[model samples]
Target chain A: ARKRIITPEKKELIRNLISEYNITSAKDLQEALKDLLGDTIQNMLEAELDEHLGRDISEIENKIIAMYARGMSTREINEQIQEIYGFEVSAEMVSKITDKILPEIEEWQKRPLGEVYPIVFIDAIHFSVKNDGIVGKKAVYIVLAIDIEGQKDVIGIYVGENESSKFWLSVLNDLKNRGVKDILILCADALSGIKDAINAAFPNTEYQRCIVHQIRNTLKYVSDKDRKEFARDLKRIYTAPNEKAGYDQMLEVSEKWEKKYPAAMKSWKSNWDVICPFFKYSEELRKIMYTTNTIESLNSSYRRINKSRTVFPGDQSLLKSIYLATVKITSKWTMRYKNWGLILGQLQIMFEGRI
Target chain B: IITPEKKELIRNLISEYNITSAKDLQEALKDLLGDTIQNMLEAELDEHLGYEKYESTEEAKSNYRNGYTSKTLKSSVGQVEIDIPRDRNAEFEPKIVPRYKRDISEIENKIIAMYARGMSTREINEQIQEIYGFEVSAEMVSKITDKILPEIEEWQKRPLGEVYPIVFIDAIHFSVKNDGIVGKKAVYIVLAIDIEGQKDVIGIYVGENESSKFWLSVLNDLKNRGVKDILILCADALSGIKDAINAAFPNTEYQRCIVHQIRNTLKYVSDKDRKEFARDLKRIYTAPNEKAGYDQMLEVSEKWEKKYPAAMKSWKSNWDVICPFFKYSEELRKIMYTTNTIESLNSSYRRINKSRTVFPGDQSLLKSIYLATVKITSKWTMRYKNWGLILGQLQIMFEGRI
Candidate 1:
């Protein structure tokens, strides 16, 4: 049996505490020892809480702010802290703590992007912000791109007055300034000025208009009753077996509905140059670059995140909130897109030195 | 995608205008549109003015609305001539449509509608501009969706049941931002089945790799969360998990997933002989009793020991954990011998995670797993397929422990 390894200093204190309490029997002494042990455990526990809660608890605090950025109301966040951690925090305190991450938001936004993004998808989302007394939605531009490794990244984000091709050019230029020398395929909607911007900035880059954009645009010309059928017909053009068959299907679609829905037909005709590049690649590459859904899925996840906040206080608050969503949504983005091996093979052959 | 609140507004507008027909409604909507937009513009100026026109505070009076400028703007209903209010500061950029903005209310509605339909960030952005003759950015979509984070957090932190009789642990791998550079990590799943045989996920933790050390913490987390006992823990042959299972719950019998072991052994076998090899392997697991199962195992060893030494050797070494299920009937063995339950759950997780190719941080991965969990658990009302027989055996084995 191991003996109690008590030092003289501790033995004397124990003796005094027992004498002061007027301990008489072994039972009383044992009871006194138990109290001393309980106090010691509590003291150790308090110290443990301090050590754990101070440094690591800040992580919880960071997550709380991240949650707030995702649109958790301060009140709900306070409740969350109470429910999850059993730590009570007022909404005001939550907001005050969240304000500490404002600098982090700036750092993330200005961070350098990768050098070569083989396929870049650009688009803008509108969020309501209370600025200058007006609570109305404003455009916050985002540029999502795929690197050579087929991993997705939000290269840049900018708050703009409105969505425009001119604004897009500046964004592309920012990417250029940050060492993005090659962008093989740039996918974007047929927003005016975007094509020219892509041309002006990355002249070597091939720009492809998103097919999903074309499908949605065509539905606008058709009535609600015809939308489903009309959308199916448009799908035939994009989903045809090969690129040649796609053009043939489009001709048929154009012939059948060109007069009735000239706007829809004209859109397909005008964007044919940009839209045809995906056909040149394999089904694997086409499946990815064919639509802007890659970036859209990213946006969709974040949009749902933003719906939590009814309104943001300032543009910076909106930026911080979006960055939080970016941090979260991208965490699941560790794996490469499917069939990267095949896509990389074709891309390597096409862009010999660039890769 | 007009919300119930917005629906109420439209209904009130219709009644106030006495709109009886589509034709009347069109005229009435246009009229209301003008008033509504003018109100929106006035609201913009009031915010610019820093207060309401009637409220006479020093802050409000400092920047008051000067007057109104009428402009014909294209709206969803039709063209409306709205009187745009001005502020003394002249710096208030009206988001309803900045000063030069027009033909855009429809765009905003369509953008909001697409966002509501669960389109991804850039999908909403690109589609809005293509379909609605306007442009929205991914940042805006992200900002709009960041709000779902709190709801997700609340769902993730919700209380789970006190006891779990069965737990299936597995992992799905990914790369995450460690500092600034990304490295591979695994999202470990701890799925528990209650006494009633209803499946539920108790915890999802991410670690650098599968190790006994991290899993110890996972088991501890479950214990701290009020799990008094776990009857059986089924897991893959990830070297560290075996020790973790025993250390965490000494009484709990650990079942090595037979399917994983078969797949692991098959890696060292030839393609042509695999079908025959699988047939031979099944005879051992499906045997009526542990004695018969070991006899079959010995038979298999005699037949294939020379051709595949590693595969046979590996099976013999792992036979202790493998043969425990042979004592139970096919009903209980099915649940204990395979990680199909967790694999199917992981498949669903993989599908949701398939879109986003890289994660920025650990919290983001947690957020994704949490959301996927909410989506999956919402649909897990059905009990495990053979719950009746499985629960019968589990209760007997666990006895008073459960």
Candidate 2:
């Protein structure tokens, strides 16, 4: 009673049934199988999600959350899911999925960090958040670091009110608490507070101010006639052989046009302490430490996927979206540290106990 | 950080530009090099972000695609304006050029500096046009200034110290454009001295009129944000203002600014005796104490009432609110002239406001005054002279309340 023989007569009976059901094509058969006792498959998918997420969730619902990370709108997600899965989900329910990612982000945020990172690039990105019924801009601080092995890591991403001296202190404290014992070179924007925070958090860490932001600032004072020449002279400074050469080139340039471009001269002089640290290093290390492009790539990865979202509902939602992007972005950061052998040897000699 | 791949790409850029060189090749190459660098940056961003220009993706292939916003990126070569991509969730931060990094600082800083420092929108426009070869509308210039709105909002909603020794209530008038018609509006600013004697702005409000209704709303907002005790409210004797303070805190003492009373009194005086009259008026306010000041004021009123009755009556009416400063020490008396504390700020508001005949809207008008307030208050780090003596007197006078 439990088993039957696979005779030609029985096979013909099954084939007749299939033809009667109009299941000639693969898609038709697939639909036929899915629709046959459909609730059981739906329930199975739902049960898996319920077990995994601690709540009842359908297969389509899981797709909804996944698509959200990729920057798909709920409305579009709904239409596509309904077309493919033969079910409908509301945008509100899709929004509720954002809440589900909170614990994941919370876990990721407080996770222990690398003990030592050769280079830690610090900067902030701003987004608009709603407060007291008005939409306003808020800063999200990202601490992106590279290890001695040249592996990239996003130590933390935090949402803050504005870029202030004190907020940076706390961000640095978070890294210290999470077990960042030492950092070799800390590359950051010309944010004085961040520089001070680094000094307070990691005393031995040398600071390298991003030269791109400085150039952007200094060029405004240069007239169109002098811009090209000034840029070449400025390039001579950053691209010089050593710290002394960079300083000499800058000195000549400043001496030649100090009165005409006093603002630019004053700016370079004020930030010289932080900006000139890269000059002491060889070209292999200088190119990697000088520009903010390492951290900027992370932002580009985020923008590629996030271009559609206008505002984040809450901090957790923002974190979850960026954390997901960070995972994908960091995967592309596997490019080896250029000339690590030379760099590692030099680092050991100059900063003995440090990484 | 620039990788070896990027350096290789940059080398290619240099070779290509060098290959196509001719007369003034160096200068022409500046613009081309900047454009080339900018293009490489955009391409790098696109490659990293997993997107391409004008290409679309299916749901199976991608999640979202954010559009680009045009911004001027100041390359050392020259100003090269390009489109910057942004994400919907506000998470995509391009490292090539970070968010909120304004390449052209002179324009933004100059616009705000001039706007805050008493330059007319017309004058600003002319200057900007001369420099950038473009004309900016007043509305656009206002939008530029409007960037401070979020900063002001956060400052406005910042938590209180639970208690303040003294709160100064002051207002400056502004003209706003509403429904295409110009309307005058009052902007009320509240400054408080914390227990440590540090000066900070407590709240700022804008309304149609300087009425107690708006004052009540302001007090309610302060209370909502955790202001438990306000020992003294130094303000002008506007109608219902005293009642509004009592209605909210009830226990807070109210004092009218004496210097304001002098200005109110002298408004009715004639030109022939204006100089002599103003000089005599100052003597009453400058007296050693309230007792001496009252005698001097009454003595002057007897002589001046025959000449200007309204002027004398005005001072007589405000004498009750104005005389509270006499109870405190001479140091406190000097600090009680809160009108002088806000004089520079009010003058900034007036000077900036006078240039714009009418604000396009309420927020625009609010922003104009707010920007001026920010510019003026940056110099307020120096505490009121004799802060130690003033705070000592305040602690004793309102011990239980504060």
Candidate 3:
């Protein structure tokens, strides 16, 4: 530690990084100071950067780990470091450090109590994991929260052999405990027993049926030849303005379809209540809730990320990477992705005391 | 060759009838006539014998206008009445298939089809005469399609598709009066894929330039078309477009194409760093998952936040919209992460508008586009092939967003 010398190459690397990132180094010619004193350079180079430890290191390391978690290649990471900081990272030790520290740091994220999230997007993505002595899919269910102020926040992520309403219930309860008291709207893909569970735990929360998802489900009941007209006719349900109009349109659709297709109409009628929630609010909220599209977008990003990775040896490795990547990616978020200012404002008024 | 047996049978019948004198032939004819006449005589007594049934004013008037030949048609009363097939809606009437009596402009329906198909009047007139055996003037064709104009206006005002998960707005540049000079025009195509996976082109608003102000009406038109929900809006980066989206669909998330975003950022970044900065920016946007992507975005943003605060500001402000791709499960984000889906549609539209840069007027552009959309939507009316699998994954991912 006393004799470690910072090399000219390292200084050059730092210099290049800052310049490339357009990062204007204000007053800290810290590298230049290290360059002047040979022994000082050694000491500084070997220095643990305790000031950079914990939170700060976690911040930067988490970014790296997050990229790793999202299946970012070391090459990609190197590229990112270069592009972002204009800093070249070729150190195996740095990679080793990221691996060791990132997992520990990201896990410290707070598990908040009850939250009053107006828009909650729930989804489960499957990844192959060796669990219970078998290599198979383990479900990683996630919920995204958009608070009353139009800001989107990640509420929770849960991993299990399979996603259950039970786990979601716990997550919801935890959000509530963590100062969330109201959930005005919930957007999700159609899943089994999720609605009942949602109703049992968080009543009064409106559920929006993903039209894109439902359309897929509805197609299964139709014949290939008649699918075009049938689908066109079916669109009238969700596309109609107002719940009443949508229902009326659905009724007309029901009449048109039931005679030809009982199963499709039955499914639609059964799901009409859930389907109408998107139509219940102002068009803005409706636009957000009409489909689990927001989540679908996330899922696409996840797949794009996860598609390349061969395997995750353990849940810890997987979660760390996932957590890091998600945190990094979502940090740019200032508010909810959708135009939720008006809707969220209304929700704030509605649930002011409760929240 | 007549067989002898058949010839003998005919000769015997002829002889019997010839052997049958005029009195005999007349008696036989009277007997047949009496039977047919008796049937009508019986029907007359049972029926309500009113003099009002003899009114032929409508028939005579129709016949007189058409200048068609008069042929007697045998009626139940044993009298031959003049047969005239004509009606008041005569400028256009379907000849081969006689439609049920209704007050509809036969000429206008064709014109509406032409306009909606975006066919030019000259093209429309020729197409009509060739297809329907009716010679139409260019002005008449224009006037005919114009008849549906009020219908078009009303239909435009009709309730629109509500809560469209994927609403794609694209504008194609065509010929029009630009800056008060005759030049190329842009007809914006506001197309939406509805909940049931049906694609609808709601509006074909044409202008010299596709302004964000016009986009507001386009968005409003979507809401007016029954668009209550829009989860994602894939649009071009027009000035005030984001605001317009807010005004129309406040809750809808907006994703500027990463491809497009890169183009915007390229305007500022240096040549060497442009590639490197873009690479790093890719890390943030193309993160494995949304969480990681967002985290990376901040880290990357911070680095440049000091230098390119404005560029970073754009990313940070739109981070919610920009980064939603990571939140979803893998299956859904693929289709949505980029505006590739809509861009494909826009590309095709550009091909159509490429025919002529500027349109003659608003209606001509509308005509071409309306026709184009009719053709495109006819194809889109089909169910999405991967919808089932996508739905299953969505069910798992968004527990209730459905």
Candidate 4:
């Protein structure tokens, strides 16, 4: 069979396949309002006109989503918005409208969670929120998830001002409502009572500790003087094969540091059960599970795009803008770990019915 | 982290001029380098003596027009201010991307350091919070360290030198697991010295198994990276590995590690003959030239090939790769023939990754190994005495390609 390979061109894509219909002509767009009062009056009227858009909102929303899915930024969207509707939206307003679809996001979350995600990684991103006394308010992290199909999805993003378990419980409760019965394996850095939350929320799961995080933690116990040798010796715990071997190596690591830093070994010993699971697998799979590489990759990308912008207005607004940016970024999912298909295929055979 | 004064100086330099806090409209070294004064005016810096970061109105106005804006980038030399450029011609991805800056990559490094500290994810997060005033989740911490991923991709895809005078092909087995089974596979690392004596770790990949098929991939990846020719390819005594090298690089010669062959042969010999075999092996490899070494190997093979056929057969089969080490100078043979230098790296890898018993997937495994390697390998530039005559020999052999 001969397969036709289509390499889509950017110019043809913008000018030919997709066309823009504008209520305002290009010549009119450059013109300033005759009066400031008239401009203000028109902007309010247009904001009102947007509600009356009705069916067109759906049309435009679909188009916006299309544009969004196709990697349009708010600025890009604002230009497109002014191009399409004569309404020159501020980036702020686009941000508002982007996140204003909370009802829709909630609806999406409420739907039954069907397929099992092979790997679920959890992470938090904190941002300042200014509202009266709420200035510098921290939002709890939104949990990011990836299913067995290599489908990137967000489980939920939580706002953790205090980062209390109470808030985390709520996130867990939301996950419960969402119908996630089991995840094959979950990889995360560390959060207290998170294991309990996972047990209460989704019982059928295993956890892989992020080795990068663990190494950092171990360094705290070692003194500044011994840190060089300490760091050099520490690599074995994450790179070695099997739990027993890692533990045996961990013991040697413990002996070296325990006198100077007893707390370090105690901490490692406490978490060794989950922390050492990554050692049983081959180096191929271990490379991923040993750290929360996937979660961090997405977050860092989102952070870079959001660099110039300061605190988002609210939790939903922040998530919306970030999610929109993330959607734009992940639209080109080619950056995902290479050949994850092969890794998951092997996973399917290993986890079998449990998956 | 950017120093407090540098931060404001940077801010003033970028956002405003004549910040009005300085004496004679000039900021002092005291306030500029030290002190934390909140609400720094969005004005230009009042540059006076000792203020390395100074900007005038003309320069300020020209910044955008001429495409030079203050952005911090980590370079090999150190932190430098590079103006992130925007080209009208549209082919600029600024080789130096200062977008995320140090806070992002540093915090990621700090987080990885915390993980290396054996701090649980929760503790690591708290520590990050304490240090950086930001709460990093276990997941988020992972994401931070993943910053290296793009950089890794960039390094991997970077254009390679055209010719390598000396290239070493060897695999260090890191315990990586897929689907929960401990598997030993090779990560082929091509350490090459180009024509100019510059040493470059040219290529890397996870081989399915350590044999001709896998060597071919390593060879192919090197070829793909742009290698017209390699003068010498040193490898272990793997039979078809030499053939595979020649297949990809027809003009290239393979040098087998005498040390590796001895160790591999020792694994097969009986204890009674071990001391005798060791003595006989010493005579053959140490006797000077390649031809004399081959004659000794032949005599040893006639005596032992029938009894321990596998041992004799391995030497005969991989002769093309094994014989070339004797042809090099003693100083060069010491390095090219054995994985001694990298053995230190591998041992460190063993000690570092000892805790990750079974991995859930491959990327995390690769990330750990890659990071560990980056840590050890980055020390390649620490001092001259450490690299010794090996690098000097490389400089002479390669001339200028490195």
Candidate 5:
């Protein structure tokens, strides 16, 4: 404040250095500057550290968090940091850095959302969590929403031991409390109780059951010999030009395979209402709503980072790991969904004031 | 138990069956085996109806015996034609020869195996006839091979790894008939080295044209199949491919094949200068780092810009994607700097598909390629060489991505 430390000449030199070295990130800038300033900056940093009675530990902590987010165990983190920074980081210290995100996880889970989401995809990824020295599978439900702007976000992540309609209802209630007033289209797998919970929570929202899941489920009852032909017939229904054509195709398929595969035909008949909602939207939006691949991609990202750690120690640890992965993954979701403007125009007309 | 009368009866029975030589004995034994199975099945149906074949009970009236259906069972004796007894309710499931099981020997699996080796339906039929001593129609062979179509669809849409350390994409062209017209089509093969270092053919897409637009759709398909990130994508410099990669995966670093680039660059050079120009081009790709490579590229440009500007233009424009391999370690660089992985896969495809000049349709083309993939990938039992070192370097270079 007293005087400009980086003068015009120094700034010009830095600018030339940046271009000469092709510096990109802050880390690149620091490495480039260190080569140029060398021992002068090192001595000054040492003097400053001595005067301040300690060094700034935030940079080291940030690195520890980064490594942790990549699914590195505390021991691995300690070893890695020791090799990179020439310092010994204890396991307890690594835990201390990661545990700080627990509160942030809670805040993120309950964070306020937009009043209306154009589309929301709800899915869960299962993980094995150890409880009382016994490993049990737990479902971590993730609710990803594409806002009115078509930007994607994971508004809620809840870990539950049991998957039930009650659990889903509670999760939706939390979303409602957090300010998700209306959803234009809620796409999800036909999980037990999800439809009923949607009916109770967001009654006005159109619920589109994932066609991929329905196809996989329907194929379970079909024989291997007829599966290819049945799936081919099934595609004609979902991929029809309109709902009427789709229904007609469904009827034809039902008549063709009804005697042999009565159960398969029964599923389509019962779920037709939920499945045909996507046929009303345009091709782009139908592609988005027909399958839950968007949220599955996020789940895949979580699975990748969490591959090394098989079983979390507790719920807080699991939440901490997933929350960190969510943060890292969502950071790169910078672009709105492709063809979002066209999709939004359709949504605006479809939802009227809801948009 | 062989009494005098029994011995005479056995002799007369053998004489009546006409057993003479070893081949005759085998035929007699086969005939006896067929009779034994037929009698056992008849007995089973007798027990099911709670009476003999001619005798009917009151309860049997509700579900009476329907007429027999002709069934061909492939047995150790070869194809044995027998009549299967059917109930009116279609509930007579035989214990010996179960319903829907036409082969007592694994002949269907054998046909599928032969089909997987790029054998045509006619070829597969010949093999079946040779091995099983039965005439299997070409149509039958087609029906059996077509069973894998669903399997191919499932394999195509199977979930992929979240991250691939290195992905190689290339296309192999084939003549395919569509709507009664034969045209050249492309089959884009995507081979990836997973984080575990094992190679996998993650995708094989059949496109009407090999354009960056189709490549963009392939990349998006990978994304939909759970490929959230690819650390390094090695590909040929198809026009607009860099833009496609950027659009589909913003974070993935593209490394255009240096060999292709050199070949492309040499296309513009004169015959007299081609050798020298290629040697000059080698220095740019083989440089240790991007800075050195960039300096070398600038020198090469300065040298060639005046004489052949077209040859130097791609290098300048594609320098960013071309130079990503320069920053990698030598082992990793060797893997990512060229599209050789997918090239080898295409070669395998070509080797297997050499017999066919034009596929009947897209599904047949896909079936052949998918089967070839199955055969080729089965032998990829080992991970890459020096994978631990490679993975360590990659984990460091691509922080939080691996």
Candidate 6:
């Protein structure tokens, strides 16, 4: 009818046990108590094991998931856990634990975003993902945005093949559906159909060409000896104080080098309008509007994480690797832009009700 | 293809020189080379006097060799101590070796190369002594590296690109001893990508602190050196950078790094609330546009304003400059949103900085940073990726400016 409990003598023994361990801090007391009671608890568990068999593997599952997120192969994860935990974990178990990250990834991929992204960077990084027993390269398109407060985030990451404006349109539409109502400026490389896709999905969004890419293409026809000078002259056109001044410089460059580098000169004349918008804003705003290095930085982080993996087993595995990398990389992106106050003042006037 | 007469001449010379092994041959060659230079110098002086040595012509009588002056010449064969025939009028300047010229074997370049690798002057002296088999004073080594000071000056004042599409300005600090006291000095490095997308370090300034006032001078130096305009200047949130940029380049867009901004914001939040507060704060920056960002900021403010008011205050006060990147394309925003361009340069400088914890003086700091810049910029051979598209977009956004 009566249950056994700790007597006064046993309580006195616990106080003596604390003295024996010489515990000082809370953590020290915790560790000492765990050590002192561990064998007794083990004996009880062993006795219970004879009657019933059950255990929680959540800690092991988390360890396996962490390794997977770091781009470790399931086999490697199993070997690592075996080495560290002194226990055999099958590759199948490792795979199962990582598989659970899929739902989380799906939710993250479709997560809603703020209604407006002042700037959105669209770029693609390639990875080899196997399909139908054949290993082929796939483009992982990333859409990174600088929110109103100037913090950056990878809004959407989609895996596809042969990047096209058609595919981008879908991605943009997805962003819209999720919550991105307006994107002030969309920075991207000169991909075919990208401009058209921007026009279709975010009609009002300004599509700024990557200046670094444009300069490379323009210099393609220019001679090697002339490239530096030609690029220098081309710089004057873009760095001109205003659009009219820039046009004057452009004409001057055309007159000076056009006869020699007709293709280079022609390319500039044609793409002049799209590339010139950053000039309209103040220097602070123009800098951020000029290139796609922000997304490139993010892609670089992914590349670094995925460096260990030569080829992913499937699209889901690749997504898991990238999704994990995104979480890790974006976590450090806490800072807003430097001098955002001054930049925002200019943006307020330049955007005119948009902000 | 040796002629019989030429073969006979070579055989006679080889026998006379007693050249048997490679070492012997080298010694013989060095002796012959030194003699050849000595003879050439004598011939140059003779021609200047309009007569050969000991031949007293009417023209030669006016500026005849007065006496022989011993001088050590650095030659390919090694250091050759030679006696130069001095003229009475001192008009016989040797054509072979100019006045005040000691090293003819490019040994100055070797010393400079060592100095650029962050070698101390004493270390340079040891290296020179080992290689040249002669004592070189530390003062001489200092003087040799000092030659680059003019070069650094020229480079610092060199005409830069008329318009640098993007310029990254950052500082690396060094302890420099002045008036017997060691003081921290900032070495400002201005790295730029030209319109062609080629990277260059256009300026390096050694200053008392990383102040906006010093930065203004650096910017002014760039302006004076032909940097008419810099479209976008990327830098950290150093105190006074915004003000300095506004004064120096009024039209140039000053992009404060987003990373620094977030760092400053989170500094105000408690660790318990930092993670959750950061997550909430992310909603504001990751907002699609300025309006959305404002909405998210409001959400964050309402949620955290009571607990961490300082974190929300910056967002309210610095909202304008913070969100400028919001209006730009994501690609461009990435480029200007942070000072990674200069951060990379600083990282490179840190590699060299590890060797010298405290610089001897301001010149030494300048010399070390300048050399490091030279070495670092050498590897920046490739232009930015997709530079063509970037230029085109810049052209359109900037319009005629490109």
Q: What TM-score would each prediction reach against the true structure?
A: 0.43, 0.43, 0.37, 0.37, 0.44, 0.44
TM-score of 4: 0.37
Regions more than 4 Å wrong, model 3: A1-54, A58-70, A73-108, A111-115, A131-133, A190-196, A204-212, A216-235, A251-266, A273-278, A336-341, A344-355, B1-402
Residue A239 accuracy (lDDT) in model 3: 66
- Candidate 1, residue A6: Cα displacement in angstroms equals 93
Q: How would you encode candidate 5's per-residue C-alpha lDDT over B213-264 as one tens digit per residue? A: 8778878888888889888877786665788999988998777766456655
lDDT preference between candidates 3 and 6, better one:
6
Q: Where does candidate 6 stray beyond 4 Å?
A: A1-355, B1-13, B50-72, B82-92, B98-101, B161-163, B208-214, B226-230, B259-321, B337-340, B395-402
Of 4 and 5, the candidate ranking higher by DockQ: 4
Model 5 over residues A1-355: C-alpha lDDT tens digits? 4421222232333344346556443234334322333332233324433453331233334556766776666566655544323345554455556665556777777677888887777777787788878888989887778887768877778899886889889888888899878888776776888888888987887787767667767877765445678888987888889998988999999998876567778878887875545777888877666554656577666766775556556677778888888887687775677888999998888878873
lDDT of 1: 0.65
Q: Compared with the true structure, what per-residue lDDT tens digits does model 6 show for residues A70-166?
A: 5556566555544323244454444455565677888888787898777667777787778878878998877777887878766878888876777
Ranking by TM-score: 5, 6, 2, 1, 4, 3
Q: Name the 10 consecutive residues with the lowest summed lDDT in model 5 chain B.
A: B1-10
What is candidate 2's lDDT per residue for A224-318, written digit by digit as tens? 44567888898888889888788888889999767555667777877676465576667777766555476656666566665555655656566
Model 1 spans > 4 angstroms off: A1-355, B1-124, B127-134, B208-213, B243-247, B265-280, B298-313, B338-340
DockQ, every prediction = 0.01, 0.01, 0.00, 0.01, 0.00, 0.01
What's the distance in Å from true for residue B355, model 4? 32
Model 3: fnat (fraction of native contacts): 0.00
Q: lDDT tens digits, residues B170-206, model 6?
A: 6667789988999887776777788887878787777
Per model, state how many residue pairs clash: 38, 19, 106, 96, 0, 88
Candidate 1 lDDT by residue in tens digits, A167-220? 777777777777778888776776778878877887877777766656665666
The predicted structure with the larger TM-score, 4 or 6, is: 6
**Better model by TM-score, 2 or 6?**
6
- What are the per-residue Cα lDDT tens digits for candidate 4 across B276-363? 9888987777768888889999999888776566677877887775655675666666555444554565567677765564544566
- For model 3, how does the per-residue alpha-carbon lDDT over B1-402 read when each residue is reduced to its tens digit? 134543443344334324353234323322322232223222332242221334555333322222232333221111232323333234323331123421124235546654454455665665444333335678876666555556556645666654556656665566565446787655666666656666667666766364668778766666666667677677656776788888877767777655445555544443335667877876775567777877887888788765455667666777666765565555555555454456556665665554345665777667656656665667665765576777666556445555
